[PDB]
Amino acid sequence: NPHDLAVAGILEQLEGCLRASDSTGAAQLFEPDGYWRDLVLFTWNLKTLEGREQIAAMLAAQLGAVQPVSIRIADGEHAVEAGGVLQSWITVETNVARGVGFIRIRDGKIWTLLTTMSELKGFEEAKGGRRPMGAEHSSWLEQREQEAKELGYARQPYCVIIGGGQGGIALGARLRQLNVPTIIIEKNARPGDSWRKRYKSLCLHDPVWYDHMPYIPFPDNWPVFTPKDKVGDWLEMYTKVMELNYWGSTSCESASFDAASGEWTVQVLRDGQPVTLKPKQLVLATGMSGKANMPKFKGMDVFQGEQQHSSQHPGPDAYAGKKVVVVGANNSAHDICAALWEAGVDVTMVQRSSTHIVKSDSLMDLALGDLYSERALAAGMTTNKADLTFASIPYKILANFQKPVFKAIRERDADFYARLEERGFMLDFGDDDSGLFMKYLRRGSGYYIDVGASELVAEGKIKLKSGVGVQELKSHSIVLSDGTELPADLVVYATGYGSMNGWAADLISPEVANKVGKVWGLGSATTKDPGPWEGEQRNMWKPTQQQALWFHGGNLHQSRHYSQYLSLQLKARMEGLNTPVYGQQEVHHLS
Amino acid sequence: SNPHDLAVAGILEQLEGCLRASDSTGAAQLFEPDGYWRDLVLFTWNLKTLEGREQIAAMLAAQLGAVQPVSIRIADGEHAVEAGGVLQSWITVETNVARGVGFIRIRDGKIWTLLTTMSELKGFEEAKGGRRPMGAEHGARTDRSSWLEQREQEAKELGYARQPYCVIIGGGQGGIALGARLRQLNVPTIIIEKNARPGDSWRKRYKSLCLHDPVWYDHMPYIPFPDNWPVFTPKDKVGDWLEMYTKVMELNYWGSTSCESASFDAASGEWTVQVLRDGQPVTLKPKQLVLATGMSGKANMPKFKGMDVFQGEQQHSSQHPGPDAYAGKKVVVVGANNSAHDICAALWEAGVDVTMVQRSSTHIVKSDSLMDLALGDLYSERALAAGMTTNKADLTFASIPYKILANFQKPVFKAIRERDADFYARLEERGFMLDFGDDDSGLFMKYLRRGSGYYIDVGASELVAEGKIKLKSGVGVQELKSHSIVLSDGTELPADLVVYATGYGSMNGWAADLISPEVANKVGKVWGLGSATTKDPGPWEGEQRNMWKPTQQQALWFHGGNLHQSRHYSQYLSLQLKARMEGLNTPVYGQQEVHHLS
Ligand SMILES: Cc1cc2nc3c(=O)[nH]c(=O)nc-3n(C[C@H](O)[C@H](O)[C@H](O)COP(=O)(O)OP(=O)(O)OC[C@H]3O[C@@H](n4cnc5c(N)ncnc54)[C@H](O)[C@@H]3O)c2cc1C
Ligand SMILES: Cc1cc2nc3c(=O)[nH]c(=O)nc-3n(C[C@H](O)[C@H](O)[C@H](O)COP(=O)(O)OP(=O)(O)OC[C@H]3O[C@@H](n4cnc5c(N)ncnc54)[C@H](O)[C@@H]3O)c2cc1C
């Protein structure tokens, strides 16, 4: 291929500079403002180097310790040319690891480079050609019962994960494949209960092609949008067959770290019994959403009806013939209001701030179609290549990729949007018009994927009062800042959640929560994501300022992909490897 | 272009030309005089191999009116290849009611072998890929019934207020696979299984047991084992997998339910099946009954002199719980088959005095050698890397007519013998009686012909070859005395326990005990090819007797086989069941007549 020669020569110069510990020379091969996003392989971190000077500074600090380095076109792949961009899958090696990557080249200059870590040399996963035999040509069940009785009691785990939802289960499967002895702590009774507990009608709003767990993808006949209990069944059965050590009915009560011994002391209550676990690494996988935001409205003590945060709302059944006011317009607000109307309960939504609304069909086609769809698969974009393609766009410029996508969504769904506005609903498209994904990555909230509620709003079936605040709650009403008085038997506060940092404050200490800082967000200086720029998700899947404390989570996509780089970092430290973190992120917000 | 594509595509259009022309004799003229057309449902509504031009013409003359118009072409995205004078190509075939994949071999301008299969019924395709269910019903409703509610409704109504179309007896690997395929075709089906949980059929075996077939060969439909799954799966890990598979594939699986009896009423077209679901009687009235109770039938119990005199324990291999109770005892196992080898190796690991007593020869193959030389080309990592997917692997194997399979296998097992020659020499020198099939065609051919007579060695044969398991061969049982067993060479073995590892009768014995001896006789022997070899008498039948296809008893079907055959032939059985559920015209051609009652 005519492009293979072009890309391979650029890669050879890069390879030459990297072997020579020539940081400046390597950076000169990039565009002046080019990007190098590294996932563990060079930085022992999740780090995006922006521009030649940052690129050179990383290479000057890391190259001496990783030699010899190779980088070349990936086996079986070829370079392609689109829109003036030369791109190719690549393979990259250090002295202790290998990985795949992706490179984009323009006018002979590296525009973007992705390096990732796939495996640690000598600790490769027993997959494919390396499969365990299973049988020798003490039984398999006996050994499992041995591990169930000894791990966490007579013998301590290397790693403890708090939280057995989708995120901890995926991370646990990955850790199991790396022989990192691990216990998952889950206060629910069974795996999958994290999803069973939602409202009757809930389904995933992300599509199947985007949603796979590691190792066992959903089958070709699995539904596009999975009902909440069908997810539960899958997670429970995934947990069994991937041989996880999963302590259900077990609450984590407290944890602390002793830098002297390098050990945590984690106090749990397993079916009522106190147990003390002493792992070397602690992972919080308690959900990206932390502590509920409770408003401080005048007269909340005067109101004689029920007040619930959206997280304490059981559903519409108890409220036939009653009147509900939902304070909020996020997706929790839309879910709760659509259920109350389907049940024939009087519901009013009170919106103070704008919301980004996207029709499910439009999100699936225009925003996910290129990477996660039947069309994507037929074109060869496998789930792994999709994850790596998305990861290869530096967060700095992703909004630029996204803007045309969500402009097309507005033109397609314009009539839908007009009717929402004519009704008085406050629309936005992210602070910079870059859309749903960027809001999710920046603030983890502020959007609703419409599966039926927005039409109920446009048609007036869900009553809307927007543009107003709450003045006070009276004895049987809530009074809005324009003077409107809404009678209310039940007030639901759909006011969101703080960051995961609240989990650390509640389980470790507020002092440790302060060391760690706000979790999630990019530092984009937009709503609920204050600057300055950090360029990677705050405290996710990477070293934190609290030693041996980690955060895992995200949506099913991010949990699938970044559980790989988190587990490889946990494994590397279990093997006593040298892991010199570059550019460890300084804390700019205590929450 | 491809120069082989043109040759094959021209041969195929002549075939298609003749078929649209209702030219049975002319279409047959396109095969070698003795060519083969193996059909899986698509043309014959049967599993049927047409052998020779006269049979081909007769089938085509009988069926063509029922399946026209027929299209047959090279498969989309595939190309013909030529090797050793043989032209091959994947093909795609459509009828007026169905579509499917096929495979064609051509030599000197004549069709040597044709494989036609049915993949789907037109208008009843599976909800997969582009046709996935949405799962969620978007848009507001007040009559909303959630996924969990509908599932709880079906559990409560099916078999009570509403009868299933099909009932499967047996919830092992075979019934679970078939159940999955039937749920994908919206054939309401109840699995009846007397064990408590799905997967218990594997949990029930001895501690150390693993699959002796490798993972690449073993997948269940729809959810393959993952890339980190072990080659040889321990039995309890197989149990957990089936238990998860049954849950996530939405099977209606009545555990703790024994099937007591069933009878068919040709007037109503209904079965009456009496079950005990947790002790409580239920009466099920399906239109179709599938027996999936395992290929092994009634245990064969020997008639030895003095069995009534022996003062120790006597067990059939199927009644032997394991070595635990026999710490200080002396065991004699009468048999040298696979049950006997498993039981003896377990007794020897536990330090029990065990002697194996062999009368007839056994075929021994090392698990590792089966994996490389017998399965390596189709079911391996190298096969996958070469584009041979599990389904392409299944179709390639199915594309070899059974009449010629034995000669493909002979060089495979000549190679296995040369590789393991010292192993075999030490077994023969120790006095173990070896064979390699009646015509030296090896393990897979015995299995297809008689379903017995072999043991895949995972460690026990070395214990025999080295004398750790004591061997007495070439002998029968003369009599049991009060505390000993006497062999036909005069040896008197002291014995606390005698295990009779003497195999099983045919699967139709299940039909005898659950339906009636008359129905069992009408159905006849199950399994076997009619190969005129040991335990497989002629005449030649060419397909597994009564497997995955219509039987001489109306609305009675048999499902089973190894994980490979269950995976693959459950597709054709479920489609035949689905076609009848939708009231399609299904004219069976060449329905096999019974030549043996058992
Ligand atoms: C309508 C709707 C649709 C959605 N669709 C999708 C979708 O398609 N894809 C997607 O990725 N997300 C979707 N989400 C979001 C989904 O809720 C989260 O993404 C999901 O919960 C992932 O969270 P997690 O596994 O990281 O943590 P969680 O799901 O919150 O689980 C964390 C677990 O930690 C446990 N826990 C907490 N504290 C303790 C303690 N002290 N001791 C022990 N255990 C503890 C909890 O019981 C919980 O089970 C949807 C949400 C809604 C409302
Ligand atoms: C060491 C060893 C290794 C093996 N490895 C393999 C391998 O790798 N691959 C392979 O394919 N095979 C293997 N086998 C063979 C295996 O035992 C059978 O192939 C397997 O059981 C398939 O049978 P099945 O699921 O069709 O029926 P079965 O497993 O026999 O199950 C039929 C079920 O029907 C139930 N049943 C019977 N009567 C009734 C009734 N009246 N009411 C309700 N339920 C009833 C039984 O409880 C049983 O669970 C191995 C065997 C051994 C000993």
Numbering used by the authors:
A (entry chain C): 6 to 142, 149 to 602
B (entry chain A): 5 to 602
Give passages from the manuscript.
In this study, we report the first crystal structure and biochemical characterization of a type II FMO from the Antarctic bacterium Janthinobacterium svalbardensis. The enzyme retains most of its activity at low temperatures and catalyzes the monooxygenation of sulfide compounds as well as linear and cyclic ketones with cofactor promiscuity, enabling low-temperature applications of BVMOs. Type II FMOs are also single-component enzymes and use NAD(P)H and FAD. Among the diverse groups of flavin-containing monooxygenases, type II flavin-containing monooxygenases have been receiving increasing attention as they display cofactor flexibility, accepting both NADH and NADPH.23−25 This feature makes the type II FMO subclass appealing for whole-cell biocatalysis as they can use both cofactors available in the cell.
In the crystal structure, JsFMO appears as a homodimer, with an extended dimerization interface of approximately 2300 Å2, consistent with results from size exclusion chromatography. Contrary to what was initially proposed, the N-terminal domain seems unlikely to be involved in the Baeyer–Villiger monooxygenase activity since it is quite distant from the active site of the MoD. While chains A, B, and C are highly similar with respect to the protein and the cofactor, chain D shows some differences. First, the isoalloxazine ring and part of the ribityl chain of the FAD appear rotated by approximately 15°; furthermore, the isoalloxazine ring appears to slide slightly forward, reducing the space between the flavin and the side-chain of His-216. Another notable difference is the movement of the NADPH-binding domain that, in chain D, seems to tilt toward the active site. No NADP+ is present in the crystal structure, so the movement of this domain must be due to its intrinsic flexibility. The active site of the enzyme is accessible only through a tunnel, with Tyr-458, Asp-217, and His-216 as catalytic residues, a combination not observed before in FMOs and BVMOs.
